[PDB]
Amino acid sequence: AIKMTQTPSSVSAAVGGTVTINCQASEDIKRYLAWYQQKPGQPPKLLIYAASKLASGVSSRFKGSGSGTEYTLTISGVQCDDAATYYCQQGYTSSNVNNAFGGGTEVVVKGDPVAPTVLIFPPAADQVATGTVTIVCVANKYFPDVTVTWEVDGTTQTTGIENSKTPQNSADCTYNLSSTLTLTSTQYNSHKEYTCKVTQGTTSVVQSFNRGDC
């Protein structure tokens, strides 16, 4: 089939820097090629058509080039508002296709660093009563990425953990993260101190509570 191979799958750039994304077609697609930007929750937005022409209203910081089987999108003067997933797409044929789109490229924009604000929430009484509890730890407004470690009476947890990170903030590049630890009510009662540890670089921020004091 006609195949679109988009690389790399992820790229990062400082604010003000340049991002380059490549698209390889398995057959000569003769510049019948478009580029899109997409942010979570929204449909994609056309940026470039006919390989190198700017769609209406799109900034000239976005540049399309290439021909035959090899195409490139360049983004200059990168801003937080550009943090998104980018897709190429061939409009050369609808026959013998598996996917008209490339696999996408996530662009991470490195803005001003910010240390996380961390909070821990013990499970409410109404949770304990269901047989299962979820302990919630949140890391708010941070950049670059952090690691979360959960500790129960000083033993590192390796199971029962789920992490959910927002997309980058389009104004300031920061993330928010929720991390949850889920245990049976019996398992939860089998221990005293519950700790969320959030590490950025080498700097750790810790929040804890004692099950008893709740």
């Binding site: 089939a1 003769k30 510049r31 019948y32 090629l33 478009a34 899109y36 997409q38 979570p40 449909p43 994609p44 056309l46 470039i48 058509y49 006919a50 022409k53 769609a55 997933t85 897709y87 797409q89 409009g91 050369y92 609808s94 026959s95 013998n96 296709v97 598996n98 996917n99 008209a100 789109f101 490339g102 696999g103 996408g104 909070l119 821990i120 929430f121 013990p122 499970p123 409410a124 109404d126 949770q127 269901t130 979820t134 919630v136 949140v138 708010n140 789920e162 959910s164 990170k165 927002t166 928010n176 993260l177 929720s178 949850t180 509570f209 004692n210 004091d213 709740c214």
Partner: protein
């Protein structure tokens, strides 16, 4: 001109489902229409299209699994025998061509959500998040056990918006969804309003320090 999709819903595997794309302000004798889907967190997948003249084309994986048809103002996508792999937001989008100039997919709908599961639709359980027992506080609510997506969460009926952070939902191993929302307030009644339209339900939980 505009495009809008409808018909997405929770459906059991094997139950045929038809999606509809209604178009306004342009002709389907000028524009070609395309169906594109996207599973949560994943890339765009072209499903197929229907040209101005009526010729329909499907992606190789999609042949025999979908049928596309159109009238003068709508385009249908029928999903023949849904499987759990078909869970996704489905978009309708228009494209066109000039002499040698492919114009791209320039107009898209907001998408319609298809969820394929043998599970029954289920409303959320809502649990308060408060610090263990400065003058300002962050409170929250943990919303768990719902299907299908989405739920909406507001604070004090949308009047509290500053300092609100809602996290993306997470599918559980049960196949149910969870999300959480926190709000920072000055410690002066703070209520999270959780709506789940798919089960005709709304839950208000007043969160206590």
């Amino acid at each position: 001109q505009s495009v809008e999709e409808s018909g997405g819903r929770l459906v059991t595997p094997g139950t045929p489902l038809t999606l509809t794309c209604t178009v306004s302000g342009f002709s389907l004798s000028t524009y070609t229409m395309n169906w594109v889907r996207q599973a949560p967190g994943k890339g765009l997948e072209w499903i197929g299209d229907i040209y101005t003249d009526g010729n329909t084309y499907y992606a190789n994986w999609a042949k025999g699994r979908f049928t596309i048809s159109k009238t003068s103002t709508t385009v249908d996508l029928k999903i023949t025998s849904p499987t759990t792999e078909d869970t996704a937001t489905y978009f309708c989008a228009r494209d066109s061509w000039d002499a040698s100039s492919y114009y791209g997919l320039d107009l898209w709908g907001q998408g319609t959500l298809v969820t394929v599961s043998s599970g029954q639709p289920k409303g959320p359980s809502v649990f308060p998040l408060a610090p263990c027992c400065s003058s300002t506080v962050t409170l929250g609510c943990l919303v768990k056990g719902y299907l299908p997506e989405p739920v909406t969460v507001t604070w004090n009926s949308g009047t509290l918006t500053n300092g609100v952070r809602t996290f993306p939902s997470v599918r559980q191993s049960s196949g149910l969804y969870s999300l959480s929302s926190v709000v920072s307030v000055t410690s002066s009644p703070v209520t999270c309003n959780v709506a789940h339209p798919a089960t005709n339900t709304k839950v208000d939980k007043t969160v206590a320090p």
